[PDB]
């Protein structure tokens, strides 16, 4: 489906490409195969991201990466890519709003769930390769709000920083107040506990 | 990782150094040599600098800003505008012109910063290149007053004549390819 859409959206195929024209245009790779080149990259990138956030043609797992310095757009539909969900920031305002959390709070008898949040475009799945092209905020309220200017172009926000930890490290209370090797050791000891 | 900046040198210490000493490895990971100066050279920093220059390997590639290989049929023609003056001065009383002049020209520009840092001399470099390749290379060097340090190198005039009636059609590397090989060898192994 992505290849069909790309053909629709003014992507010249490698076979039809004059060799001279490649130099000034971005190369579009899909699953590691160089499909063609596109003369205007940013418009295509925005359209692909809109499609993924609406879940129309591009599935949520599909990851689009644009390397602006190297003039390459890479789209991976491959399996085995590790992804984490991140809130989406437009302008400097989080897309997640009080109406969404109100619907989620009454998750029972409203049939509003994480899938609805993903479909609404509030959250998105980002793999590491796409993480390289994403400006993230650890805490939304602190970093999004205007201060002494550090970054005014945040594109995504972390849901909560404590989710970086795994299953065994999550049982540690106050992990940030410990030495790192001690958290590592507790991860191993917790597997051997009795219960 | 947890040495100090006081050493100001790469030093292998700990278990890897113990293994190097125990196994008596032919090649240490960081071979080092501590040189103690004899007399006034130890007292004065400048004399120590002289000894340093004497002890540190320096090649033409370190002091060469850029190299260009030109084709100039006539030395008097001076295809490069800049070298007109000193080529004309040298050919006012030309040397080795009687044998011939090789048309291909190797032009080497030497960075003044590196030249003065190692305290090398243009005449010194010319002498070293002349000794290394014998008479097969003819070198023309600018005066130090010139803003750009230029060394002009041509194939041997006797070799250009070939000094042989048969002349052999082998024509190994012609002259341009031979000049490129000469440039690579000079840059890598000049040992000025």
């Amino acid at each position: 489906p992505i290849l069909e859409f790309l053909e629709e959206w003014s992507m010249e195929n490698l076979e039809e490409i004059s060799p001279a024209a490649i130099a000034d245009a971005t190369k579009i790779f899909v699953n590691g195969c160089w499909v063609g080149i596109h003369k205007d990259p940013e418009q295509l990138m925005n359209t692909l991201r809109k499609l993924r956030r609406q879940m129309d043609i591009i599935v949520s797992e599909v990851s689009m990466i644009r390397d602006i310095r190297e003039r390459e757009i890479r789209i991976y539909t491959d399996a085995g890519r590790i992804c984490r969900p991140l809130l989406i920031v437009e302008k400097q305002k989080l897309l997640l709003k009080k109406r969404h959390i109100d619907q989620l709070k009454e998750r029972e008898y409203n049939n509003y769930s994480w899938q609805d949040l993903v479909a609404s475009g509030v959250v998105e799945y980002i793999d590491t390769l796409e993480e390289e092209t994403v400006m993230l905020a650890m805490t939304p309220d602190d970093l999004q709000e205007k201060e002494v200017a550090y970054c005014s172009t945040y594109t995504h926000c972390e849901i909560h920083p404590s989710m970086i930890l795994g299953v065994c490290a999550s049982i540690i209370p106050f992990p940030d107040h410990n030495q790192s090797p001690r958290n590592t050791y507790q991860s191993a000891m917790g597997k051997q506990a009795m219960g | 990782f947890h040495y100090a900046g006081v050493s100001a040198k790469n030093v292998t210490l700990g278990v890897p150094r113990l293994k190097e000493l125990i196994n008596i490895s032919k090649k240490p990971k960081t071979p080092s040599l501590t040189v103690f100066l004899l007399g006034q050279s130890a007292r004065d920093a400048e004399r120590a600098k002289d000894i340093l220059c004497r002890l540190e390997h320096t090649t033409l590639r370190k002091v060469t800003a850029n190299t260009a290989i030109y084709y100039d049929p006539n030395p008097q023609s001076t295809v490069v505008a800049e070298d007109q003056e000193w080529v004309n001065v040298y050919y006012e009383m030309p040397d080795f012109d009687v044998a011939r002049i090789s048309p291909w020209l190797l032009r080497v520009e030497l960075d003044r910063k590196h030249m003065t840092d190692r305290k090398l001399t243009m005449e010194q470099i010319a002498e070293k290149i002349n000794a290394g390749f014998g008479d097969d290379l003819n070198c023309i060097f600018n005066d130090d007053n010139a803003e750009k340090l230029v060394l002009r190198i041509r194939i041997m005039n006797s070799d250009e004549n070939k000094m042989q009636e048969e002349e052999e059609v082998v024509d190994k590397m012609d002259d341009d390819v031979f000049l490129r090989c000469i440039e690579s060898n000079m840059l890598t192994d000049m040992t000025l």
């Binding site: - | 947890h2 040495y3 100090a4 900046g5």
Partner: peptide, 8 residues
């Protein structure tokens, strides 16, 4: 975890 000269 301390510094460059100390320990990690």
């Amino acid at each position: 975890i301390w510094g460059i000269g100390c320990n990690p």
